[PDB]
Design a protein around this nucleic acid. Structure first.
Lengths: 114, 59, 148, 210
RNA sequence: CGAUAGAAGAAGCUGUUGGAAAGCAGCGCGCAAAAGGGUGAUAGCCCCGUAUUUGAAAUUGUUUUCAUACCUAGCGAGAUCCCUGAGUAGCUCGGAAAACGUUAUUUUGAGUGAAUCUGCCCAGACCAUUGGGUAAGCCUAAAUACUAAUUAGUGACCGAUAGCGAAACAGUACCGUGAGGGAAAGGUGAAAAGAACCCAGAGAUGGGAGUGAAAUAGAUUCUGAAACCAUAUGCCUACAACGUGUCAGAGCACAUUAAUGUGUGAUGGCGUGCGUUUUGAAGUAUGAGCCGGCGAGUUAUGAUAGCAAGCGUUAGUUAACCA
RNA sequence: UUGUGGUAGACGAGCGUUGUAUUGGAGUUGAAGUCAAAGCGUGAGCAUUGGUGGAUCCAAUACAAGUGAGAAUGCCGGCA
């Protein structure tokens, strides 16, 4: 009862190598190497998915504090102004996108006056 | 399988398990032993639960 | 059922893999650990082997059997509590072999046993009898004749 | 239960027969039936597959490599299961019986049960020994009778106890139909056929056999 | 009764796409046969064959009967008449077989050596009684292992890396002097129906051309995967410190299992392989060039534990053996 | 409500392939195999389509594996 699994192994390696593409040179030509490349790429993609949300808030803090200190006030001042009175849910990204919205940031700065 | 000839010569089997063993140290000198030890070692006992895992697999 | 719908109920219990696959685990020694004598192929301990410790049999004295070279004669024992389930009356070896309490192509000495009182008088033809069993069967109005 | 005899005219007989309630099953156990049909399927091997072990293969006693100075595997044996010499280390052997012991108590209980269902499956049509008389071994008349009985949908089994010759002179040129003795039948055979004809005389004997 | 030669043996047309129809569909028949094989793609009815009906001059095998060789033959009675298997049984020195590592019993290399069925042997030292049989001569079909093969058939057998080393002209080629060890590899096609004829070229070879349904069937002749070699559509790369990629993303060219699409990325952030064994390796610890197949927890028996079932308080269950 | 770090290791539930067996179907009006493309899946996998391809398969269920390849200074073969 000889049982051959050549076709099964070939199909498995084919579907494994189908994921790997666009590598450097011959790297997307070896099954064993491409396996490690795919696994490492997946792990690093998970890491980037975990940390991009971590760094985007800091990016928006930079991009908004630029405008704030251009008006003569730190990002800390804006956070305090939001904190004590008239607490808003407007996100740091959306408040950063208000820069992309013309004639809007002035409305916020005049509104937060107290 | 076969039953260990050397082992079976020293352990009896009672109802519902409780393999009966023997007591050693009856060889040489009574004066090295006390009266209670001499009168109690004559009684025979049964291997412990921890020992039972090493007795059940033996036979 | 049918050969297209043949299904079990609780059969096909879980198995163990010892040399196939690691994503599902159990592709290594699979329960033997790493770097051990038992972990090697056919690595185990002999029943008398205890890692260097003296085997248990050679640490304790041995039994002595006066019935050495002698085979004890077996005795079919008739306990009153158990034979109460038996409906046989006027007991003799001829009737017992018909009820397969003893093999038909065999004859063995019969012993009476058990103080469990019964409530019917019968005829007993046995070879041995216990004193308390004898009292129990004589007080039950049954007749007992000892055979030899 | 009750069943009506069928005739050579392709129709049931106008006289039904009473069947004792002691034959119809009242405790349906199909897992024992599954085991019985397995044991019918089991013990069907022929010991045709085999393999050679490490010592069963031939070859010289040469050592491919010495104790040292080799940049590859030590390879101290001339033949190995992974070498080109072949031979699976375990493989099949012509000694694996693969036979399962079954007790006749549960087997007979399940057999009586399945016979009860098959006699009450509506697929059975009672026949007799008389109609096969004046008939010959020609499969033409047999095929015509089956077409009238429209039993070609499933394999038709012919339980035989008196060995009418015309029955075995037929059912060989056709695929679905076959003949076997009352004892020779099996639960697997009964369920696989799903169509059958019963002589009127083996009823009492089958019920006594239970 | 067979075998070693052999014979007979039933049942279709139309259309269909297809080179080719037997497949497919309709209308028919068929029988001891619709087992199987071949016949242009898997034919119950094209052919062989099969079931079935039969046949052996000569040779050879098996069984029975008959005439017959050879063999064996009962019952009594008298008699302290004679005999019944000697270097024999045995005892001792070393042994061995016996489950037995020398113990009843049996055998002897060495020594010794009875009685005559009134006797002996044995009844695991031995002794008495008792029981049984009288060694010291021989033969023995029957159930028994086994296939080297023949005949017919089968394979919940392997399909050219497997299966005998050997599908192929295989223990051949080949090696060591030599004992000895010990190779690889099958598939055109349907019929060669083998590429006619022409052109370049010395030819090989190639291109048209033809046979052929098809030359993605051209002898490297079922297909032609992976590793590897090029080739160009489009994009990018010659200030460039990255286990080489991720998250994004300008622009460019497109347009799919139509979907926030694909390819690709000037540039920003981030990021020191896989198994391995160790307390542990990006490791200057080891292995791995890569690719393709192959490649390593089975089985026979028995026990235990778990779950389910059958039976179930003397039931269950048969080992073996037989149909 | 606890939740979904984890080696050894324990435990549970499944998938893929071959064959056997029954119920089915497709197939020179193209099967498998192969390559490719811009799918579905928690994954074992399942597809769909294009063409090579030229005659085999797939679907549902139990039974049994020479059953599931990432290395073994792994075996052979091919290739730099």
């Amino acid at each position: 009862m000889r049982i051959k699994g050549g076709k099964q192994t070939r199909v498995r390696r084919k579907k494994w190598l189908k994921q790997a593409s666009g590598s450097f040179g011959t790297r997307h030509a070896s099954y064993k190497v491409a396996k490690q490349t795919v696994i490492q790429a997946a792990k690093y993609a998970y890491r980037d998915r975990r940390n991009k949300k971590r760094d985007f808030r800091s990016l928006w803090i930079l991009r908004l504090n630029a405008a704030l200190r251009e008006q003569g006030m730190t990002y800390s001042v804006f956070i305090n102004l939001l904190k004590k009175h008239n607490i808003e849910i407007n996100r740091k990204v959306l408040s950063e996108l208000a820069i992309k919205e013309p004639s809007k940031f002035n409305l916020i700065v005049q509104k937060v006056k107290s | 399988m076969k039953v260990k000839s050397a082992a079976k010569k020293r352990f009896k089997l009672t109802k519902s398990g409780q393999i009966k063993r023997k007591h050693a140290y009856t060889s040489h000198l009574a004066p090295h032993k006390t009266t209670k030890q001499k009168r109690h070692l004559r009684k025979q006992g049964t291997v412990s639960a921890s020992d039972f895992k090493r007795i059940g697999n033996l036979i | 059922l049918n050969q297209l719908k043949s299904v079990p109920k609780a059969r096909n219990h879980k198995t163990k893999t010892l040399g196939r696959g690691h994503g599902s685990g159990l592709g290594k020694t699979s329960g033997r650990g790493q770097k051990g004598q038992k972990a090697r192929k056919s690595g185990l301990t002999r029943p008398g082997f205890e890692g260097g410790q003296t085997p248990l049999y050679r640490r304790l004295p041995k039994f002595g059997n006066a019935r050495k070279g002698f085979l004890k004669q077996e005795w079919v024992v008739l306990n009153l509590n158990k034979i109460a389930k038996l409906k046989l009356d006027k007991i003799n070896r001829a009737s017992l072999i018909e009820k397969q309490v003893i093999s038909a192509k065999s004859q063995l000495p019969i012993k009476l046993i058990g103080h469990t009182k019964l409530e019917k008088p019968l005829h007993f033809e046995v070879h041995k009898v216990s004193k308390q069993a004898l009292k129990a069967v004589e007080n039950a109005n049954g007749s007992v004749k000892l055979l030899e | 239960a009750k069943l009506k005899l069928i005739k050579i005219d392709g129709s049931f007989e106008t006289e039904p027969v009473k069947l004792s309630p002691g034959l119809i099953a009242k405790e349906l156990k199909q897992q024992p039936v599954f085991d019985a049909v397995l044991v019918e399927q089991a013990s069907w091997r022929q010991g045709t597959h085999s393999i050679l072990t490490k010592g069963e293969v031939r070859g010289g006693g040469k050592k491919p490599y010495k104790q040292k100075h080799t940049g590859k595997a030590r390879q101290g044996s001339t033949r190995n299961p992974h070498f080109v010499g072949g031979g699976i280390v375990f493989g099949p052997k012509p000694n694996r019986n693969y036979s399962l012991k079954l007790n006749k108590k549960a087997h007979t209980a399940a057999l009586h049960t399945v016979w009860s269902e098959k006699l009450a499956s509506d697929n059975t049509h009672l026949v007799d020994q008389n109609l096969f008389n004046k008939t010959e071994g020609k499969t033409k008349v047999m095929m015509q009778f089956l077409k009238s009985a429209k039993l070609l949908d499933k394999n038709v089994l012919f339980v035989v106890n008196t060995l009418n010759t015309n029955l075995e002179q037929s059912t060989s040129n056709i695929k679905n139909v076959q003949v076997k003795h009352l004892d020779k039948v099996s639960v697997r055979d009964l369920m696989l056929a799903n169509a059958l004809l019963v002589e009127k005389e083996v009823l009492k004997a089958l019920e006594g056999k239970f």
